[PDB]
Amino acid sequence: AVTGQVDVKLNISTGCTVGGSQTEGNMNKFGTLNFGKTSGTWNNVLTAEVASAATGGNISVTCDGTDPVDFTVAIDGGERTDRTLKNTASADVVAYNVYRDAARTNLYVVNQPQQFTTVSGQATAVPIFGAIAPNTGTPKAQGDYKDTLLVTVNF
Amino acid sequence: AVTGQVDVKLNISTGCTVGGSQTEGNMNKFGTLNFGKTSGTWNNVLTAEVASAATGGNISVTCDGTDPVDFTVAIDGGERTDRTLKNTASADVVAYNVYRDAARTNLYVVNQPQQFTTVSGQATAVPIFGAIAPNTGTPKAQGDYKDTLLVTVNF
Numbered sequence: 001a002v003t004g005q006v007d008v009k010l011n012i013s014t015g016c017t018v019g020g021s022q023t024e025g026n027m028n029k030f031g032t033l034n035f036g037k038t039s040g041t042w043n044n045v046l047t048a049e050v051a052s053a054a055t056g057g058n059i060s061v062t063c064d065g066t067d068p069v070d071f072t073v074a075i076d077g078g079e080r081t082d083r084t085l086k087n088t089a090s091a092d093v094v095a096y097n098v099y100r101d102a103a104r105t106n107l108y109v110v111n112q113p114q115q116f117t118t119v120s121g122q123a124t125a126v127p128i129f130g131a132i133a134p135n136t137g138t139p140k141a142q143g144d145y146k147d148t149l150l151v152t153v154n155f
Numbered sequence: 156a157v158t159g160q161v162d163v164k165l166n167i168s169t170g171c172t173v174g175g176s177q178t179e180g181n182m183n184k185f186g187t188l189n190f191g192k193t194s195g196t197w198n199n200v201l202t203a204e205v206a207s208a209a210t211g212g213n214i215s216v217t218c219d220g221t222d223p224v225d226f227t228v229a230i231d232g233g234e235r236t237d238r239t240l241k242n243t244a245s246a247d248v249v250a251y252n253v254y255r256d257a258a259r260t261n262l263y264v265v266n267q268p269q270q271f272t273t274v275s276g277q278a279t280a281v282p283i284f285g286a287i288a289p290n291t292g293t294p295k296a297q298g299d300y301k302d303t304l305l306v307t308v309n310f
Contacts, residue, residue, distance in 0.1 A: 001308075001310070002172070002173045002183065002308040002309070003183065003305055003307045003308070003309075004176050004184065004306050005182055005184055005185055005303050005304070005306070006186050006187065006188055006230075006305075007186075007187045007188070007302075008187075008190075008233070008251065008285065008302035008303070009188070009300065009302075010190040010191075010201065010249055010251075010287070010299075010300040011191065011298075011300075012192075012193050012195060012242075012249070012295050012296070012298065013193075013298070014192070014194060015191075015192045017194070017197060018199050021199060023199075025260065026252075027202070027258050027260075027286070150257065155191050
């Protein structure tokens, strides 16, 4: 019998809120990274942007304050922690990655707070740009591949 | 004068130990559930994970032996027994809950042994995922809200 304590805390004072999300039960549904349909072996880098579940556009984070606030954005490694989509039935995997800039260069490194700014009376967008490498080796099995990345807007 | 007996017992043989805790005086400090800063009325479900007081990551329970032991985890209802954080100065309360899975579905029911597995030469993590409902009604007073959940790793 090892009984222990867990201090719970919350500082209600002046915070920042994330728009574009829908409450899926008790977990915020931020959006979808829909690469679309594809064949077994694709030569072009498959690329799609996150579509917020609430509006359809990009996640719009706004801060409830007057002065500028510097908030951070961190995305985790997905269900299996290595950013791989898994086929619903078979065990095939599809490696992918999420970048922050339009040219697939600034990668949202696993469990890292990619910095962000937010200004007076405005909603800043959180671009989560997906990208998949060209698979020109083995044709992955037919079906639907999925993953649930947990995006962590933290301060 | 009602004098009575209390039998004390301890079976020293082959037990299981919880890592990630720090001994706060004579009580094991397991960790912190830090939801962060927030405004009076938040529309998004505030959500944070427990951070072990010893390492900063998740509580890592390991057992001492060779056969996989099945240990249980039970969390209580907090200081007031209804999972509410209380403002340090005023009497305002903030209802919350702790779940076991990443999607806020498998709730750690009050005083219930949520089952767990553990194999030899490995440490299993105890995910205590916090979650707070969207308060879009009354703005709670400014300040710090706290609670001390007692996590009970028992066999």
